[PDB]
Amino acid sequence: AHFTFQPEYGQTQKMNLFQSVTSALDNSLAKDPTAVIFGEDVAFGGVFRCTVGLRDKYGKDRVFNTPLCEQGIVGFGIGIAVTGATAIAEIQFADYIFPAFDQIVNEAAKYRYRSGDLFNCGSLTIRSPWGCVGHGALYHSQSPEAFFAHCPGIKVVIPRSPFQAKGLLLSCIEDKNPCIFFEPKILYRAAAEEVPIEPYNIPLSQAEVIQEGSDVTLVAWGTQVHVIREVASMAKEKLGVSCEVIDLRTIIPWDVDTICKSVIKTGRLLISHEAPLTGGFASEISSTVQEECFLNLEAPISRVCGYDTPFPHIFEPFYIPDKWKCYDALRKMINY
């Protein structure tokens, strides 16, 4: 495996990432009588088990399957939300969210603005499995967040663990704006930690400094957070370099202040993501940090990302921005 996962709100219970999603969904339907969950094959529990037991507990009219049509799933979800009911739509793989791009970008994102707030679909949340998985190749490995980042009106949120996933998903479900929640599928079973059984919220548009450092700032999201956490360890051990590790968590609207504050202190920044380099979200963070921290930047900001190719099957080990690729970039930046 290319990463290693490493682990106040009341009673907790050990939960892997798919169990924490189920817990968030369960808490939601229990406290919101209007809430419904729908998509492709969610009735029997889902292909990643995220909705197991929910239909039996809440009823077939609240947890149900739709015909196989992603544009339909999103348009249908928008319509439910327009009436004020909570709609939690599932897109089976993030790679299949594209048929719904028009409904997301031209409709959901613009619903409130274009009606002067007479109508909205703020109670809509779209959840979808995301990121590489070792052998998913072109259509079971994608990280589409940068496509959505250029669309004013929606929020895009990506957790790095079970505890983070339940708190962030509950916040998305309750947020008054259409949200896309991307679940790193490689972590569904791999990552397990203590998760509060009752509902709790983690704020959107707030990054989390998970490790203080003074020489360089490292930023990532999803599974890649664990990769840069390891890279921080390698830099300390091999270079005597103190790394500040930051989980962005919300892609848009993103936490510009936390990132700039960190870079003003360290003077160096490395951003990493599985998605291709060109047009990737690291470009937005880099351009922005350069604009706000020009005087503090000691070296050029580095972006360690996937290559500008479709996501390959047999070549995955060579494609991903692994710890060695991140470490080498960091070494060179330190040496600048």
Binding site: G79, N120, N177
Partner: protein, 366 residues
Amino acid sequence: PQFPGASAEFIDKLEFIQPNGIPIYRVMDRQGQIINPSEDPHLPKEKVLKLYKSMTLLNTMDRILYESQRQGRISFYMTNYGEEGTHVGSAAALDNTDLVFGQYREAGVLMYRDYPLELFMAQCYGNISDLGKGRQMPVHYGCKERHFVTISSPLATQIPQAVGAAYAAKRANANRVVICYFGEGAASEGDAHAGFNFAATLECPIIFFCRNNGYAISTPTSEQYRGDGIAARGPGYGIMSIRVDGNDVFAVYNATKEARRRAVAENQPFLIEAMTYRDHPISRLRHYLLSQGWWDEEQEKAWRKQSRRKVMEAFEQAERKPKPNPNLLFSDVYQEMPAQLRKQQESLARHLQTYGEHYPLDHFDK
């Protein structure tokens, strides 16, 4: 058989099923005469006069706003010519709270629901009275009070949305139906297939109202579909369907009234395809009014005068109102305003303080 896909028997000879003409339901002829007494809805005089006045007032507004667009006073306009009967007739068959989704030819629904001339015009002019805050192009109407969901330009996107609102209505169990209007061109979009199928499989109380006028801009229907119109697609989705004469307000009313009654009772979708064109709905209803002794030449002249006057008063008022504060360009993107968006708003205020003379500030509020 024993197959989990479709109930059927076997056949021992190879036979391809051919596209097996759906008749057009009509209640009154071109001379305004009721063709079959058992189909007369016998609507009360007051209601029928409201149908007539709503249709003609829409026509009067169309004439003035069309000219306005030609003079460049408003940037765009879409008339309702030929669609007055389909919309006022169907709207009259709905309960006032039934939710409506549509596209560009549905102003008659709002007119029947007593939407103010001042608001139709505020939207077209993008002035301070527009609750839409001047953000969309003209004729993109919306009214929360009258349950008319704001129109958007991308064709057919409102179809699966209308199905989701209908599903939620079903769950709320409050005897409401959703109606969704669209053209035969829009029926070609993938979103139309999604909406029709979802409505059937999820058992939604929704009426799909398709206006078929033979053209989508320059495209004739021969280049749009090859089956027997849109009505012929209903059965294949498992949807009860009917075709009606769009120039006959009574035929439209009857079909919508019955579709609404059954959709709400059975939680099942209905498809109405109304045939219209480019024997005009206004002309046909006027003949009916005359035959009942409900209208005459003097009443026609007085109304044409009172309507022209009502429309021009709203028009003059709309043109003199200022546009909204430029700050409104930044709100409602999200419910709250993200700090980075506020930063952009502040950036504009600073810019205008210095370069304001180069902008049309005198036209905007504040």
